[PDB]
Amino acid sequence: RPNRLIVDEAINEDNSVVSLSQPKMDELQLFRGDTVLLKGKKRREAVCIVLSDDTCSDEKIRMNRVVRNNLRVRLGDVISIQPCPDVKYGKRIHVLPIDDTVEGITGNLFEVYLKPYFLEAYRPIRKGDIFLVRGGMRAVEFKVVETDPSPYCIVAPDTVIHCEGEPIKREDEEESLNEVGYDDIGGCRKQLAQIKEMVELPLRHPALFKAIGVKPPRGILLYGPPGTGKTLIARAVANETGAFFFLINGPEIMSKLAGESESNLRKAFEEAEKNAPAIIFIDELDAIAPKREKTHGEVERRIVSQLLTLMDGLKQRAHVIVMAATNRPNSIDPALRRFGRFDREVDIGIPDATGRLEILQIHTKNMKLADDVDLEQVANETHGHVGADLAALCSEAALQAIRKKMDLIDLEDETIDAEVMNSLAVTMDDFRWALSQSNPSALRETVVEVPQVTWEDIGGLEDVKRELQELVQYPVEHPDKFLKFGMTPSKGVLFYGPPGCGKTLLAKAIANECQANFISIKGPELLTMWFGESEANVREIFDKARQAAPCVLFFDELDSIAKARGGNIGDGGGAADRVINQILTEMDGMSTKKNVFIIGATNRPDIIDPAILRPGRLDQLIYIPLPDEKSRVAILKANLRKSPVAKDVDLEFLAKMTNGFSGADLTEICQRACKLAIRESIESEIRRERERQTNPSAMEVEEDDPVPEIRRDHFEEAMRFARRSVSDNDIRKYEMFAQTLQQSRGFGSFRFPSG
Amino acid sequence: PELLTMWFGESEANVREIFDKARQAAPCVLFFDELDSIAKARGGNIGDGGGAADRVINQILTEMDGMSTKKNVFIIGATNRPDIIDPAILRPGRLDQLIYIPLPDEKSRVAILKANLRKSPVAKDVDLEFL
Ligand SMILES: Nc1ncnc2c1ncn2[C@@H]1O[C@H](COP(=O)(O)OP(=O)(O)O)[C@@H](O)[C@H]1O
Ligand SMILES: Nc1ncnc2c1ncn2[C@@H]1O[C@H](COP(=O)(O)OP(=O)(O)O)[C@@H](O)[C@H]1O
Structure with missing residues (x-):
């Protein structure tokens, strides 16, 4: 039967869209914009509008959440799709809001919600379905109770809409909304995929794999900083697959008067084991099973042993799955990692860059942002924040926006009408104010992310790029030739050269190109x-680096210790x-199959420990010279x-004139150019201001006080105070070390001996 | 390290x-690599x-002298800087015989090149004698 299809998560969030692949349209002769009739479980029915989308597979259908709940089906099931061309324009529509969605509105719902949503939409509806309308600060659901013709109709301008009456009370099998789904999680794609990989199968189909016979997982550890949203992940998984999520809190088992704590645990487990595919969630695990030496009394030991024996006694059962959330995976008792107990560890890191954008776009859903709001800019600016901080920031912004306009009712016992409340445009100013008075929480946390520096930020180092490419990209691209030819791939690279230059940019660029995480450790x-x-x-x-493979570990200023202990100290x-023994040992203990590089940069190579430069450790040495002439113009261009330009002075002239400089010096010169430009612009503005204060309304209109374009004179002023950062002696010393290491490489070619 | x-x-x-693990799993050949690292790190600015x-050397010595000939536990130590090693090690009963490993020459070079x-992919290749 080439008509049925399996439902899947969608991208388009409109209530009347589905995404089918073009071969499906070719097979079923499906156009764009037609009306299709969807059959599902429980003999439910709804209609939708077909939209083209190539991302979904042919056998796969993408559909949003409102239609999915309309059909009373979950993701992973089967539905029947067909063309339905007999639908014609409706005549009258009777809609009634739900009771537990309009608490405190008391306004003209027709002009507020229905009029924009039904405008020029031609949305087909069927009697008995539920659809959700976004609004001012809340979401309101309407259940269509009557339409003409029944059951199918299409929205037309000359249709009768009735929006008056006693709101209908909630149903039972309605699968109540506002419960967290998969759209409420952002910035956690990989970890959510990993969790869904091993939990969907034993929960959706419970009998099949048991008949086959495998060991299903019996414990998942979610560890990360507080506020990253682990309970949200657990609740979303439980509510999507279909289960009996039974949270048991941490402190609630400790506040009980001793004796009945174990009784509560036993009752919880025995209750959860009968309700069929259950998912227990032990929040705040470290509160009841801490490290062994931490515990002092005796009730804690009894509680821990009770938990352990219950976990061991869990034998198959009705596929009950236990997840526990902790803060750091070294505080719990070490005994809760033996095989059979919690064994799979999944981390939830702090969202970075894009993840903050998705979180903000999720939270700023109902509120009507003004067109000047740049969510991307705020996401880029704010770092060291987690999901909870972003939610609090958005809430504070909303309250700041609503307080300055407190002339709305302030008296009416009936809550505010939606009319004025829909006239709140939260601006950039409120967001900036809320961001100002907000303390982050993450801050001092090692950051694992993909750096955004491209291979265009650097301009020179043409052959060093080739060397790094050979060292890095090939092992992960074509492992077969490496394993056949016999070589073990290199594991470390060491950089050395004059201070500054471009070591860190090279590391970040190669991490970006190879598309792998980056971890930086500084000398301090x-x-x-x-x-x-x-x-x-x-x-x-090293554990964090290994678990997040692939990654490019970086050891900046490896010579700092040698410099420190080489003096009076x-x-x-x-x-x-x-320190050196630890670095050596956990480089020696790294399996070559795991893809974890190590890169170190040293200012002074000679005084470093020669034990490191041994096979099986940092072996390859790459010399990074001082950029000269042709490289320098590219440095300046980069x-x-x-944002401004320099259309006047020639870059090549200053490239020729400034030979013998590091990149840091050129960036310093360019920065002082902007500093001079800022000074001149601000002093011009001050002069203009005082010349108005001398004579009121001196100039009715203003002009272009010095245009945002860096002129030549600023360049000369900034260049007059130029520095030669490195003296020649270090250059001779580095060249001497280079020729010394090269002197061991000396030989006078060949003649093809014994051909 | x-x-x-x-x-x-x-x-x-x-x-x-x-030492206990070496003894209980007899026979075994316990290996101590880079034995000179002790006095190499000892000498310096620290x-x-x-x-x-x-x-460390004295626990090594005390445990070594406590060995019994009944168990076939053989101790081998390797170093590249012999002039610095503590002389108390070089006594009868402890590590006594000294064997010098020279640089490979002629037939040794051919043998290691063959080894x-x-x-997998050596093809038919060419002679190794001249190398
Ligand atoms: N996509 C998301 N990622 C992370 N956190 C989120 C996300 N969406 C919402 N949150 C916030 O996470 C909070 C719930 O997380 P919480 O249960 O406190 O985790 P934990 O208890 O482990 O700190 C919610 O109040 C919500 O504001
Ligand atoms: N294309 C480039 N080539 C060389 N240097 C650059 C380039 N772009 C920027 N720089 C400068 O080089 C400096 C690199 O120094 P830094 O990363 O602080 O320490 P390190 O000496 O370890 O590289 C940066 O401060 C940056 O301003």
Whole structure:
């Protein structure tokens, strides 16, 4: 039967769209905009409008949430689709709002909600369905109770709409909305895919795999900083697959007077095991099963042992699945990782860059943003925030917007009419004000992300690009030839050269091109884990790097310890041995199959430990020279993209004139150019202001006080105070080391001996 | 690296269980690599691991002298800087015989080139004598 299709998550959020692949339209002779009739479970029915979309597969149908609840089906089931061309324009429509959606509106719902939603839409509806309308601050659902003709009709301008009456009370099998689905999660695509991979099958079809016989998972650990939304993920999964989500809180089991805590745990487990595909969620696991030495009393030991024995006693059952949420995966008791207990660990990292954009677009759904709002700019500016912080920021912005216009009713016991409340355009000013007075929470957290620097930010280093390409991209692209030819791929690369230049940009660019996460460790951190402890930090950072493969670990300023202990200070050498031994050991213990590179940059190469430069460790050495002439003009071109231009002075002339400079110096010069431009513009504005205060209305209209374009004179002023950052002696020393390492490589070719 | 790590504290335990594990799983050939690293890290601008150095060497020596000939446990130590090793090691009963490994020459070079020449893709290739 080539008519049925399996439902799937959609992208278009309109209430009357479906996404079919073009071969399906070719097979079923389906046009665009036709009316199709959809049959599903429970003998429910609805109509929709076909839209073209190539992303979905041929056997797969994409559809939104309102129609999915209309059909009383969940994702992964089957529906029947057909053309339905006999529908004609309706005559009259009777709609009635739901009781638990309009609490406190008391206004003309027809002019507020129905009129824009039904405008020039031609949305076909069927009697008995429910559709959701976005509005001022809330969402209102209407259940169409009567239409002419029945059951099918199409919206036309000359149709009768009745929106008066006692709101209908909620149904039972309606699958109440406002419950979190898959659209309420953003910035967690990969981890959500991983969770859905191993939980969908044992929950949707429970008997089939058991008949086959496999070991289904019996525990999933979700660990991450608080506020990232782990409970949201668990609740969304439970409400989507179909289960009996039974949360048990952390402190609630500790507040009970001793004896009945174990009784509560036992009752919870025995209740959850009977309701069939159940999903228990132990929130705040570390509160009841902490590290062993933390516990002092005896009730904690009894509670922990009770939990462990219940977990071991869970044998198959009705496919009950337990998930526990913790803060960091080293605080729980180590005994809760044996096989059979919690064994699969899935992390939920802090959203970065784009993820903040999706979170903000999810939260700023109901509110009517003004056209000047740039959500992308706010997302780019704000970092160190988690989901809860963004929600609080949006709420504070809404309240700031609503307070300055408190002349609305302030007296009427009946709540505000939707009319004025729909005339609130939250602007950029409110968002900036709310952002100003808000303290973040993440802050000091290691950031794992994809850097956005392209291979155009740098201009020179043409052959170093080739070397890095060979070292990095090929092993993950064509492993077959490497494994056949016999070589083990290189695991480390060490950079060395004059300070500044472009090491960090090279690392970020290669991480971007290879499309893998980037983790940076600075010298200050190395010394921080050099004056006190030395072991914990290295273990945790390497574990984090390994778990997020692929990634490009970076060790900036590896020579800092050698510089520090090379002076009068001679006591921290033991910790230096500690740090170097940790780095050596957890490079030696890394399996070559895992794709985790290591890159280190040193200003002074000679004084570093020669034990590192051994096979199986950082081996390849790449020399990074000082850019000269032709590279420098590209450096300037890359730097001065900014926003203004320099159409007057020639870049090539200053490239020729400034030979022997590092990139940092050129960026400094370009920055002082902007500083001079800002000074001149601001002093011009001040002069213009005072010349109005001398004579009121001196100029009715203003002019272009110095145009945002960096002139030549600013360039000369900024260039007059120029610096030669590096002296020649370091250049000779680096060249001497280069020729010394090259002198071991000396030989006078061949003649094809013994052909 | 592990030997250098076990200076700072844990200078008794780790040696104890490694020797115990070597003894219980007899026969075995215990291997100590980079034995000169002790005094190599000892010498420098720090001079603070010297107590750690002597304690590690002394647990090694005490456990070595406690061996019994009944168990076939063989100890081999390797180093590349012999002039710096503590002389107390070189006594009868402890590590005594000294064997010098010279650089490969002629037939040794051919043999190692052949040994490294297994691979899957060697094709038919050419002579290795001249290399
Ligand atoms: N896509 C999202 N990602 C992360 N957090 C979100 C997202 N959408 C909403 N949130 C916020 O997460 C909060 C719930 O998370 P919470 O249960 O506190 O996690 P935890 O309890 O682990 O800190 C909600 O109040 C919501 O504002
Ligand atoms: N295309 C480029 N070539 C060389 N240097 C550049 C280029 N673009 C920017 N720079 C400058 O080079 C500097 C790199 O120095 P930095 O990353 O701080 O330390 P490191 O010495 O480890 O690279 C940056 O501050 C940046 O301003």
